[PDB]
Paper text:
We obtained the cryo-EM structure of the SARS-CoV-2 S protein bound to compound 2, used as a prototype of present series of compounds with antiviral cell-entry inhibition. From a dataset of 3500 movies, two main conformational populations were isolated by 3D EM data classification, without applying any internal symmetry restriction (see the Experimental Section for details). The most abundant conformation (74% of the particles; 3.4 Å resolution) had one RBD in up position and two in down position per S protein trimer. Detailed inspection did not reveal remarkable conformational differences nor additional nonprotein densities that could be attributable to the binding of compound 2.
In SARS-CoV-2, S is a transmembrane glycoprotein that forms homotrimers on the viral membrane and that is cleaved during virus maturation into two subunits, S1 and S2, that remain associated in the viral membrane-bound S trimer. The receptor binding domain (RBD), located within S1, mediates the binding to the primary host receptor, the human angiotensin converting enzyme 2 (hACE2), while membrane fusion and viral entry are driven by the S2 domain. Prior structural work at near-atomic resolution has shown S to be homotrimeric and to adopt distinct confirmations that can influence its ability to bind hACE2. Specifically, the RBD domains in the S trimer can adopt an “up” conformation or be buried inside S (“down” conformation).
Numbering used by the authors:
A (entry chain C): 386 to 434
B (entry chain C): 533 to 621, 641 to 676, 689 to 730
C (entry chain C): 44 to 70, 76 to 336
D (entry chain A): 731 to 827, 854 to 1072
E (entry chain C): 927 to 1121
F (entry chain B): 731 to 779
G (entry chain B): 975 to 1023
The structure:
């Protein structure tokens, strides 16, 4: 439904990490990277690729 | 853009359903939307059009079916609370609502079935449901004079029944 | 249930629905039984006096590649076959009046080529058939309803004794279900079989030798509706009142009674539905 | 109180079909709330009939209008003015002052019609005394009726006839003051106004509930439907639906409790109409203050206003 | 009176209108109770309504979440029935309380109040039991026929006004008499009649 | 009867700030309850009078 | 059953699921009490009158 819906304040973020690290970049998670480098909001509403 | 016809409209990711009509309110250049007292969307500005249009929901209200009685007849008349009678798909327009299936008459009788707003419909005899303004009772004026008095010359004892549920 | 009124929402024949008559009677050179699209639940009513009508074929495309169902009627037993059958354009059931023995035998049972595999096979309870070719009005009326839901196939039928007029009768009788099938398969179209009444007067070939006689059947679709059903003491359904056939009908459904006392009742609140859909977006053509 | 109707389905699930199917699992909740309001709607119409329609026939006042020195012109209907309402009635009306699936059904009895019932009872009382409540009205001259009413409260007849000029002036003067008093402040019509405000606030509160998230991603039902998956909607919509039913349930429950108070008030009104407007009530303080000579009923928006004539002893 | 009683007996048998109020109470209670039983069948947010079916069908960790919805919904349904019931009880109590007043005011003693008991003046009342109700037969007196008569407030016989005592003056024209308001009897004026 | 007023915030969410924010999502339920209760408390004064 | 205890023991992403149930339950208790009081108040009012 992304094509149909419309939005404001679009933000694009790119970073590269190991596959073990893939799990960490998600809402409400605890990881070394996630809790010390980059942490997504609890109410975050965006796709993670 | 379609105006004054009910339509499904998606304006800048906002979805609702109502007749769209041009509105006089002065949107200060800065504001895109609009809202009412109860915080419901009332007006929007088309991005391309850049005009302000009022939004109101198309119709509402239950349809009430008036029946004389199954034993008496198999035909009924329907009253719609909301319809102005141009909106709905023998039509009589009343304050209570839009009524179909009944031919109203000037003469007034007691209200057998109440359609609301002072109009009542009852079966009459060849046979069709009729809606009319109710008359409360026969209008009779008692004579009043400085020297006139009325005293009963006979009396009748009558028994009347009152029913109440105690428990 | 006994002596109670129950409102059930499931596929049913809408009261007073459009009925499409299909004719296979020669009366001249008239014979038709073409393919018909089948929606969710297709109602079939058959009126047959000489049992010319005998079978139903159901399939997605009848390609012998997608599973299809065939019901063939035999005097000994109703035959239900599930199988990837390869049907011809023009299937039928053949019967001949032999002078040496006055009986009606099958002439060409080439309805199908073969069966690659069979998901399911079945034989219906035993019953018997008249097998008479004599001309006349349809002395009996037979109705079957076919619907498929949740991977099951359901057939409900009842038989009407009074021939009366050619068209379906005004009197209303409920129908019990003969069978249900475990086999679950998709269905997009259907067809009905005929008994060719082949005789000595006919040319004597599969393309031009045939004189069938009278046949008649009507096919009607089913849509979801709310139906109020009255159940008597014994438990058969004596009469049914439709929820949305007219203003009076809706009132009965709401009060759950066949007879509605004089008064005003409110049902089925109406909201106008939008004629067209409009999407308005910004003129920007930039690709982000 | 003004009839209020809420289609349960419209408010809770909205226009969208998905909201309806989810609501269907709940079963009777949607219907009972809709049904409960209808009972209150019908009951409100019933209250007016009981309170106002206590007369079989509509009486009419005599053209000559000789009432032994009592000026009833203000309470009685004026032909020139529209809606056949008395000056006192007009003042009262002036003082007092579908959005989203909520529809206000109009009253069965119109304001003009109610004004007429009140006029009829009032017309009957002046001409026929208390006799009209019991059977067909029998005309008695007002002085005699007044004299007879005095006898009920324990003052002899001679007092009324001898003091008729004085008694009449006080009655005319008393009527002037009530009219003057009503125009000056809204305090007199406070009880009627309170009913309207309480009902209005409940309705308004209900509308505000729709905005509340109730733990959903977003308040608007369409936004959730538009921006979420079909499987994803089992969870988000459900919180919204549960909350909305509770909001509806609170409103319906509150309305019934409010309705009962009004129902109780209507019964009191029926007794007052029966006991005071027709007949004389010996009960102390039921009608007015002091010994109660008579009562007149004037229609008000969604209410009955009673003018009571009472006898109070001035000097000792 | 004897004839009047006959009509009421005849009236009750012919139509259910007289007993409509009592009938209404029973239907509502029956309906409310019936709805509550019907609610058990509805599943608020679960695979199935039957608790046993849910238990067999789904796992123990998972089952708790599903059962909670059924419990929550049923509990709300029960609460609605109770809340609705209390309000209904209130209506009956008020109605029940009125009957007690009527019984005391009307059956036990004559009541002066107009329309508390019946229509017109109320001589007496009788109480009859009904299923879950009390039915009152009210005997009331209503004047039927009246004749217009000329009247005067007081009679000035010897320069001193004479006012009727417990009566209202009426006259044919030829002669003047004093009579009671409710029924008409004529008595020649005397010292006893007026003061 | 004894007039009782209950603060919806204090009884439900409690002292905790997190409970206050979650309560806010529900709407005017906390407020509506207070209105009903005071009105009952106000009514009790009127009765004695 | 204690807000202080749930708040300390669990972190905000997952605290809210537990805190929500308590809030919903308590709200129900309050409404029942408030509804009960009104019925009781109505009875008292009739008695008062
Ligand atoms: C008072 O009314 C009663 C009741 O209507 C009258 O009694 C009837 O009189 C007629 C004519 O004499 C009789 O045929 C009936 O049998 C009587 N009973 C009824 C019930 O009608 C009575 O005549 C009237 N007038 C009086 C007493 O002056
Ligand atoms: C319920 O069904 C039975 C049949 O199963 C009905 O009973 C019939 O009663 C009459 C009495 O003479 C006779 O026909 C038989 O004793 C019974 N039936 C038959 C078919 O012979 C009974 O009346 C039914 N109840 C209904 C229709 O309400
Ligand atoms: C006292 C007497 O004998 N007769 C009076 C008369 O004096 C008076 O003028 C009249 C009223 O006009 O009523 C009579
Ligand atoms: C609705 O009825 C009113 C009657 O006063 C009329 O003025 C109005 O034009 C009608 N609405 C339409 C045609 O949309
Ligand atoms: C009653 O009417 C007559 C009409 O002739 C009049 O003379 C008399 O003054 C009136 N009575 C009053 C005002 O008491
Ligand atoms: C009665 O009141 C009206 C309105 O104030 C006035 O016109 C009239 O003169 C008053 N008095 C009499 C005796 O008519
Ligand atoms: C009584 O009053 C008026 C005259 O004042 C007259 O029209 C009517 O016919 C009379 N009725 C009776 C029953 O005497
Ligand atoms: C008035 O009453 C007397 C009663 O004795 C009677 O003689 C007289 O005829 C009556 N007057 C009439 C009918 O005018």
């Amino acid at each position: 439904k992304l094509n149909d819906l419309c939005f404001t304040n679009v933000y694009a973020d790119s970073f590269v990490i190991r596959g073990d690290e893939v799990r960490q970049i998600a809402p409400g998670q605890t990881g070394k990277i996630a809790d010390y480098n980059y942490k997504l909001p609890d109410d975050f509403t965006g796709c993670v690729i | 853009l379609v105006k004054n016809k009910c339509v499904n409209f998606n304006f800048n990711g906002l979805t609702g359903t109502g007749v769209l009509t041009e509105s006089n309110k002065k949107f200060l250049p800065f504001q895109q939307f609009g809202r009412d007292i109860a915080d419901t969307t009332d007006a929007v500005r088309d991005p391309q059009t850049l005009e302000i249009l009022d939004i109101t929901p198309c119709s509402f209200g239950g349809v009430s079916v008036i029946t004389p009685g199954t034993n008496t007849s198999n035909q009924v008349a329907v009253l719609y609370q909301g319809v102005n009678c141009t909106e709905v798909p023998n039509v009589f327009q009343t304050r209570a609502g839009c009524l179909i299936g009944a031919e109203h008459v000037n003469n007034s009788y007691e209200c057998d079935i109440p359609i609301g707003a002072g109009i009542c419909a009852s079966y009459q005899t060849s046979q069709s449901i009729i809606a009319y303004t109710m008359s409360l009772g026969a209008e009779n004026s008692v004579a009043y004079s400085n020297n006139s008095i009325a005293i009963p010359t006979n009396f009748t004892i009558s028994v009347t029944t009152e029913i109440l549920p105690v428990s | 249930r006994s002596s109670v009124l129950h409102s059930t929402q499931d596929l049913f024949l809408p009261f007073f629905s459009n009925v499409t008559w299909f004719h296979a009677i020669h009366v001249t050179k008239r014979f038709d039984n073409p393919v018909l699209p089948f929606n969710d639940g297709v109602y079939f009513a058959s009126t047959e006096k000489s049992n010319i009508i005998r079978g139903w074929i159901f399939g997605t495309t009848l390609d012998s590649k997608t599973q299809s169902l065939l019901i063939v009627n035999n005097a000994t037993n109703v035959v239900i076959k599930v199988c990837e059958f390869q049907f011809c354009n023009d299937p039928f059931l053949g019967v001949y009046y032999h002078k040496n023995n006055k009986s009606w035998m099958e002439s060409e049972f080439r309805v199908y080529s073969s069966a690659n595999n069979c998901t399911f096979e079945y034989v219906s309870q035993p019953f018997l058939m008249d097998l008479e070719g004599k001309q006349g009005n349809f002395k009996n009326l037979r109705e079957f309803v076919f619907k498929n839901i949740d991977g099951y196939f359901k057939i409900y039928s009842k038989h009407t004794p009074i021939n009366l007029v050619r068209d379906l009768p005004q009197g209303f009788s409920a129908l019990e279900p003969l069978v249900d099938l475990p086999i679950g398969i998709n269905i997009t179209r259907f067809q009905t079989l005929l008994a060719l009444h082949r005789s000595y007067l006919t040319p004597g070939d599969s393309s031009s030798g045939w004189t069938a006689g009278a046949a008649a059947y009507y096919v009607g679709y089913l849509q979801p509706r709310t139906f109020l059903l009255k159940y008597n003491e014994n438990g058969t359904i004596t009469d049914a009142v439709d929820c949305a056939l007219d203003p009076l009908s809706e009132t009965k459904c709401t009060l759950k009674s066949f007879t509605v006392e004089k008064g005003i009742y409110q049902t089925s609140n109406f909201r106008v539905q939008p004629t067209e859909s409009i999407v308005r977006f910004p003129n920007i053509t930039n690709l982000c | 109180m003004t009839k209020t109707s809420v289609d349960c389905t419209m408010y809770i699930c909205g226009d969208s079909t998905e909201c309806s199917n989810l609501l269907l699992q709940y079963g009777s909740f949607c219907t009972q709330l809709n049904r409960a309001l209808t009972g209150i709607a019908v009951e409100q119409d019933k209250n007016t009939q009981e309170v106002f329609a206590q007369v079989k026939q509509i009486y009419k006042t005599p053209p000559i209008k000789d009432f032994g020195g009592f000026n009833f012109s203000q309470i009685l209907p004026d032909p020139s003015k529209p809606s056949k309402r008395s000056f006192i009635e007009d003042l009262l009306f002036n003082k007092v002052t579908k959005f989203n699936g909520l529809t206000v059904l109009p009253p069965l009895l119109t304001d003009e019609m109610i004004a007429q019932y009140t006029s009829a009872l009032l017309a009957g009382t002046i001409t026929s005394g208390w006799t009209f409540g019991a059977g067909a009205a029998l005309q008695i001259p007002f002085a005699m009726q007044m004299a007879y009413r005095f006898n009920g409260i324990g003052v002899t007849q001679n007092v009324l006839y001898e003091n008729q000029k004085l008694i009449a002036n006080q009655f005319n003067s008393a009527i002037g003051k009530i009219q003057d008093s009503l125009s000056s402040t809204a305090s007199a019509l406070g009880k009627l106004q309170d009913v309207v405000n309480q009902n209005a606030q409940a309705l308004n509160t209900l509308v505000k509930q729709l905005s509340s998230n109730f733990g959903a991603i977003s308040s608007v039902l369409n936004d959730i439907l538009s921006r979420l998956d079909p499987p994803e909607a089992e969870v988000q919509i459900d919180r919204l639906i549960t909350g909305r039913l509770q909001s509806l349930q609170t409103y319906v429950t509150q309305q019934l409790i409010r309705a009962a108070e009004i129902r109780a008030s209507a019964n009191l009104a029926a007794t007052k109409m029966s006991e005071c407007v027709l007949g004389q009530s010996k009960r102390v303080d039921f009608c007015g203050k002091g010994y109660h000579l008579m009562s007149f009923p004037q229609s008000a928006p969604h209410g009955v206003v009673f003018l009571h004539v009472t006898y109070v002893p001035a000097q000792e | 009176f004897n004839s009047a009683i006959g009509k009421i007996q005849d009236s009750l048998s012919s139509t259910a209108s007289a007993l409509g109020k009592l009938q209404d109470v029973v239907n509502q209670n029956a309906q409310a109770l019936n709805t509550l039983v019907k609610q058990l069948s509805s599943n608020f947010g679960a695979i199935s309504s039957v608790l046993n079916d849910i238990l067999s069908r789904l796992d123990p960790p998972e089952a708790e979440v599903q059962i909670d919805r059924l419990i929550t919904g049923r509990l709300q349904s029960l609460q609605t029935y109770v809340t609705q019931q209390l309000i209904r009880a209130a209506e009956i109590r008020a109605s029940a309380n009125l009957a007690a007043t009527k019984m005391s005011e009307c059956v036990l003693g004559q009541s002066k109040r107009v329309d508390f008991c019946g229509k017109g003046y109320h001589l007496m009342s009788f109480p009859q039991s009904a299923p879950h109700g009390v039915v009152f037969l009210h005997v009331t007196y209503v004047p039927a026929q009246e004749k217009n008569f000329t009247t005067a407030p007081a009679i000035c016989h010897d320069g001193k006004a004479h006012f009727p005592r417990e009566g209202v003056f009426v006259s044919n024209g030829t002669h003047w008499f004093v009579t009671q308001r409710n029924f008409y009897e004529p008595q020649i004026i005397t010292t006893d009649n007026t003061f």
